[PDB]
Design a protein around this ligand. Sequence first.
Ligand SMILES: CCCCCCCCCCCCCCCCCC(=O)OC[C@H](COP(=O)(O)OCCN)OC(=O)CCCCCCCCCCCCCCCCC
Ligand SMILES: CCCCCCCCCCCCCCCCCC(=O)OC[C@H](COP(=O)(O)OCCN)OC(=O)CCCCCCCCCCCCCCCCC
Lengths: 168, 60, 176, 459, 304, 63, 125, 51, 156, 88, 114, 78
Amino acid sequence: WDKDVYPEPPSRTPAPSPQTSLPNPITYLTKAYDLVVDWPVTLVREFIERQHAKNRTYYYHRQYRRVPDITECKEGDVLCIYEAEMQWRRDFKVDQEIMNIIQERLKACQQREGENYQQNCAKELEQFTKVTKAYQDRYLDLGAYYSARKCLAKQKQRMLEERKAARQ
Amino acid sequence: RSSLFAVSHVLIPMWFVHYYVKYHMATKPYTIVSSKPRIFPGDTILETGEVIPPMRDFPD
Amino acid sequence: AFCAPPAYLTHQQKVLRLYKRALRHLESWCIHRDKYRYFACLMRARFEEHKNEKDMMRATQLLREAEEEFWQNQHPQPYIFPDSPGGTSFERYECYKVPEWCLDYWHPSEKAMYPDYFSKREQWKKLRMESWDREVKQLQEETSPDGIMTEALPPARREGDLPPLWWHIVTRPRER
Amino acid sequence: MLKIILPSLMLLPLTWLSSPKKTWTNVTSYSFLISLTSLTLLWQTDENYKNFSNMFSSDPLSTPLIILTAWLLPLMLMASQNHLKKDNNVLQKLYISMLISLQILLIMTFSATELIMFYILFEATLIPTLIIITRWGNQTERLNAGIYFLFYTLIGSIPLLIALILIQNHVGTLNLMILSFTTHTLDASWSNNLLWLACMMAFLIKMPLYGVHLWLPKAHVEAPIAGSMILAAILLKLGSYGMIRISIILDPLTKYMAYPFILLSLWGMIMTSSICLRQTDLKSLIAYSSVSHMALVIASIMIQTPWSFMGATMLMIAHGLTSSLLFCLANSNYERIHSRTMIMARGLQMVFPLMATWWLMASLANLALPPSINLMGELFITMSLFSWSNFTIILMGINIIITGMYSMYMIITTQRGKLTNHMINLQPSHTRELTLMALHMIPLILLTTSPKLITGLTM
Amino acid sequence: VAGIFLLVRFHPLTTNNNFILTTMLCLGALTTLFTAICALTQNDIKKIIAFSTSSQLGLMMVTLGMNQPHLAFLHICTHAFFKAMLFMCSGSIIHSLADEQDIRKMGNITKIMPFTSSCLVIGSLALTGMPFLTGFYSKDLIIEAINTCNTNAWALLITLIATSMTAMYSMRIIYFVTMTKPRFPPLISINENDPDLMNPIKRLAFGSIFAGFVISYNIPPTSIPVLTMPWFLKTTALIISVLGFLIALELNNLTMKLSMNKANPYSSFSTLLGFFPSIIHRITPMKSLNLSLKTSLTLLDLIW
Amino acid sequence: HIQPRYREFPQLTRSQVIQGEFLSSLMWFWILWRFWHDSDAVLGHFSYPDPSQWTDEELGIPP
Amino acid sequence: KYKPAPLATLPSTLDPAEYDVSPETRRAQVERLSIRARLKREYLLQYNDPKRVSHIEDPALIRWTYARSANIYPNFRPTPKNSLLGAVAGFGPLIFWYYVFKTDRDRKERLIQEGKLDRKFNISY
Amino acid sequence: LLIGWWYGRTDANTAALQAILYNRIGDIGFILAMVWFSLNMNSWELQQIMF
Amino acid sequence: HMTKDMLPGSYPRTPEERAAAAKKYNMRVEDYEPYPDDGMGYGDYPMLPNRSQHERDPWYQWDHSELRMNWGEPIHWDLDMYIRNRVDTSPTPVSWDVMCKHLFGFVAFMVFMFWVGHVFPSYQPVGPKQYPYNNLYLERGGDPTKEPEPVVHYDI
Amino acid sequence: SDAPPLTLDGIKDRVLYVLKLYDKIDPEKLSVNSHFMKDLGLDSLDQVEIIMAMEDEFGFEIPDIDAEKLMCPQEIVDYIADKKDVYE
Amino acid sequence: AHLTRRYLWDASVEPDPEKIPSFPPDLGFPERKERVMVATQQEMMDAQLTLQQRDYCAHYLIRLLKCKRDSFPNFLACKHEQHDWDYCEHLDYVKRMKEFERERRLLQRKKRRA
Amino acid sequence: GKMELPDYRQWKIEGTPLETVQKKLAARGLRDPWARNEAWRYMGGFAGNITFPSVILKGFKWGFAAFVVALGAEYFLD
Ligand SMILES: CCCCCCCCCCCCCCCCCC(=O)OC[C@H](COP(=O)(O)OCCN)OC(=O)CCCCCCCCCCCCCCCCC
Ligand SMILES: CCCCCCCCCCCCCCCCCC(=O)OC[C@H](COP(=O)(O)OCCN)OC(=O)CCCCCCCCCCCCCCCCC
């Protein structure tokens, strides 16, 4: 859990001000819980972490060298097109996960703010709209048989119109 | 009977559930997302030793 | 549920059934017993007013008019006893009314309990493979050769013979 | 793949030189072990696909079909066992060999890379099915049923072959993923429209379109239970696999040369779900159910969206399992009453109180009770077609209603009335058929728990 | 209450659609009236209770349309207590007798079965709106907002007509089941002295008495109500419930007096459900099925 | 446990009557407590001023 | 007065066929009852008969299924109103739905081409 | 399953199927809503849907 | 086992055929009436009253009870819709022509009156509510950097 | 609350009880076999009323076809016993 | 009532609920004061109020929520506060009614000016 | 258990609405042979008229009593 990826803003919790003389069950109930649920489960997780610590193991995040793109890939040579298409699928999946991260970042803010989500949950909504625009420009109307070549055709069918707009 | 049932049908499950929560649901970022606690003037927050000032004179 | 309708109902039966239905709907309409008795006596007077009449044509006409009056003055939500058609218990225990042959497939370790029961069930069969052949002849021989026939059945005229076609009227499940 | 095919080829000698008492047992056990070994295909740690040779290959779309094929085998063995029980040892060994040959050819045609190998196997699937249906059926119209099946299929398959040759000539190969990395757009000319028609009609027949559905109900009603099962589960899927594989090169024609089939599917869906309300034969009812479900698959392949293909695959597998289950359930009764008429036997759930559960769950699935893969497919097909055009939801809802109607009709006219007390021949439920139903259900629970193995190419 | 729970969960989106809120307000009210009417000439306790449930649900849909979701939910929650205790006492009476639900064959329950009679009266009062028995704390606020908001002036009327029919059929239950003479069979094996029957109703009755207090005085104020209005709006629910009770007393004492009951079309309609079932459940099946058979299976598949 | 009765008013235990009487008395005690302490909620606590009883100085209207 | 309908039929009371006393009526009733009783006797000589291991058949049910299933085409004859019902039922609705969907799709496509549409958050299809 | 407890009663089953029918008619609209939200919001959660 | 002489057939065009058909279906040659010849597969199958299975007697101990139908009795071509879990033709005190009219009238009058009450609503004599910060422009979405069209709420 | 089972002597008691309560003919002299027409001279209408009273007494209906044949308390008791399955 | 006075009698000299502030505000008010707000945006936002609820009486509502969260196990200890909030809402309702009557009187002015 | 049946020499029309119905049926010239059956009710534990007050104001006595008790105790405790 990297708090930069997942912000989780801080918590302004106030002081309990018991302006009365009648007790509060919740407090003694929480104490009883701490004593009869937390303590033993904590000890057990400590034991398990002990076994872990004494027989640790490490695993690495696989890196992927960059290969040529479709642009430098001839019109019928498949040894290159395979590499390029695999790379494109890889980046497509990573972009799926990026968008899912943004959405998981927006739901939390909505739930947190509550009735103030229309005023305090705006930069997240803006990031969402932006990444949505990007995902749409990259992958919206490709189809079930999507591929780097169709993405490239989309890019060019967009850029020619943008060029017309630029010149006039 | 009440006590043995309590134990064998609440405690054990409660232990398993506390384990699950504490070590597979709070270790993850956005699994337990509480709303924010109401704060009113005079409620002195504790995470910063702060105190927000009271309101204005009430006409009446 | 025990007999069969005759080829045609007679004027007497028609009038009796009309009287019964009229009284049931009078009960439905009048919730109190005093009112029910009052108007039942009134209705029986209306009926008896035409008991010593014999003109069949005028009788059938009175009946055809009374049935229309009934259809026009009938309660649309009459009282039906629970276990009767339209009642809240009609065909409610048919789920538990399991037949008898369902025990021929039981497993020895199931009839091992209730052993005194299954011994009787056995000799109840011995009482059936013997009492079968003569139940046919009693029908063959008691047949109307003039073609006519209806849904009636005779008893047995002997000491030892049993009513033909009994196994299913006997042996049927409780109502509960 | 060869580690899956060679043992399936060895199941034959085992069958023939096994003693007349242990052949069933041995072949069933080893078929189960084959089903087990087939799970190597699920070790997909990357988005790269498997390629064991120039002749074989596996994908997230062919793996589930293959595993369902290797799983259905021992179930068909167990189900074809009570009948042909008196039949001679040689005859029942013949039956087993037919089943095994179907298994092998279906595995091959799901693991194939070349369209023409796919073709020869998708057309060799006829011999064993025809033989099973004609040599072990009980009626006298099984002959006409085999005629219909065989010839519908071949009439649809010839132009596909011709199109494959035309391609093999224009391009130099029929190999998949090369036909992908080299595909070109087309000219939208009449020759290419007829190429589309040719490539498609074979599969649109093998999975019954509305208008050419007149071979499935026959074949089912007249065929034994193993034939019914395989026909409902996999032979209706060969077309879907073939279209999902051949639609990549026909671009951009299916944007406008697909409307008629979308229409026919969305309408025949209703017009068969309704027959499922007033058919008397339980087997024909379930056949028309299969038709109304394959209509969705067709209409979802036609529109070419990821959600659509996902739903197509999910519903393919789910309907396979559920239809096999329902067919075996009806067979359990047929074996006891020798009549496919539904309203004849009633008031069960009294003497068969457990099989009334299997009857119920197979119905909860067919009517898409969540959480279930039937629904995880129907829902996404509905969403895809709603994006296509919002007016499809009307017909989708009508079909949903009629499904919820006829499923419960099939339930209630068999298990939820009062008994036909005059039925002395209701031999209690066999452990064998209870095990059949359990083996059908449990995998649905597991695939509902882990539906990541069932999405398909896109996901 | 599942659909009402759906709509409260989605209240953040109905707040700005005066076509949804307006078909709610003009539909829910169409049921308060159409079912209570049906609940005035039925003879089965179960059917009466079900029609009353439907009327209350129409009321909750009305208060949803008028933009009072929290009020609708409060009614959902304060309705369960007594609408369960009513079925409870009904089933007690039934299992005591020989499985008969037709009120026309029971009576004197107030004396032959005190416990269920008391609990039934408590439930009926809570349903009518007695000032503090878990009915008030929701129905009073609902019937105040109904007339304090800008609304549809026909719903605003039929809602109250049905709120009166509530007390009407409740008095019917009370009078035909707990006030008249024992027109039930002569054999009597009544027994309601089983804890598994006495304690559940005792519990649900404590609920029906105190739940509205306990909740309304602890929940948060997610909506500002209008405590400013004339007396003829502040007391309308109570007044009209009383008037319904009295009209029912009169029309039920008229059941005596040895005056025959000439059937009428109003009562026939209310009894046969407005014929909605009797006609729809006969045409729609016939069409659907004759089509399924003669057109698709016969004409298209097996023929053409 | 009990003895069925025929065409008569049966024997009545004490629990089933005392409990009903208790529940009813409790309901009426609650009604009375409430109607005493919070009568407003059924009668009113905020009068409805008479329109036109105001003065043109307020709600200013020039002549 | 009660107006009968094909869905709310006429009762037996108001049916003048009932109360008819003609011999051509009572004789027919007696014959019908005789047939019914002969069939019931036949069926009960099989129900209660011991030594029966199997179930009872229903030739009437068999006839009914055979008629509703397989005796259709052998008696089918093309006629007017038959060809027409078939053609309509088969094609009409397909044409209707085709034009519905085509109009909708074309409208959507021209909107998108012009850019006059709002596709906010649509990232799945 | 509960209206139908007495599966010999040929009216409890009619009632059960009636309920099934009407509730499927409601499920039509439920699924319509789910589809609209899944497309126009790429979500099915109250949180996103509240936007 | 059955035979082509026990199974149904084609339209009878002679009494030599009607006799055999009625004696096969187990009816009498008078009550037997075949379906018209509109080329629809019916053939020689009985044409029987379109009455449901509710009309029949519940008190009779039938053979097929749930269907309320005897053993060899000829079966109605449309039994699947009259099996008593379905269409009910049993009569009704009120008559179709009047019940349909009453229901349509109730519904249409109530709809018309909904529209009347919409044209002439009901409300209370007050002004619109007032929220201080420009109808809560910021909280209610708004935009911080920009400014709203300011509005004022006065006393009395 | 389950009601007690029936007995043949109980049904006899109840039937003779209702018939004693009857007034039109029965001079409180009713043996088990007091035929209504022969021994007491009643009408079929009175018989209808008698069967309906039996029904209102026991809690179930007698089909008219089978009630048109009951003319003796013994026949009534026998029909009711056959229906309620008594004397196990 | 206004209902009759509008739907049966002169419907053009009776106000419309959606056009109450139509006329200028100061047509009879010199130096018409403003309605004040003694609750701050932050003081109202940190309390997690609702947008149908953070009106001109949110300060008493804040006191109510405060005295409720406190003394909690003993509800019914928030009556003196509830009364204050109900009173301020009643006075707001009074101001609205007086706006309505103002506009009706101005309609009287317009119909008497000709 | 053996069931008993009370004598039929006590179920009499006298003193009930059955008697008024008999007056009316005599005014019209008729008799009721069954009234003595229905007369098992209308007399005995089933005798008397129950009222809507009778059912609604149940418990009210002790309810009001305890209400006044608690009111006095409240005034005491201030
Ligand atoms: C009961 C049903 C009737 C059964 C009897 C069937 C009778 C057969 C019909 C008679 C023969 C007519 C077809 C003649 C084929 C003409 C050649 C042709 O159409 O091929 C064109 C196209 C390739 O053209 P292209 O690549 O663009 O360039 C030029 C060629 N290098 O390549 C192609 O398009 C291949 C076309 C192959 C023929 C397709 C036939 C129609 C396909 C749709 C229906 C399929 C169902 C069976 C046929 C139904 C009747 C047509
Ligand atoms: C301001 C608004 C006012 C207007 C609002 C309008 C809202 C739309 C209303 C649509 C609902 C009407 C159609 C509902 C069909 C109900 C059919 C049915 O009730 O089936 C049960 C019925 C037996 O029920 P019953 O008559 O009560 O018999 C009880 C005997 N004691 O008989 C049966 O058992 C039949 C079993 C099923 C038969 C097959 C049904 C096929 C499907 C056809 C119905 C669906 C058609 C679409 C309905 C509209 C939705 C698009």
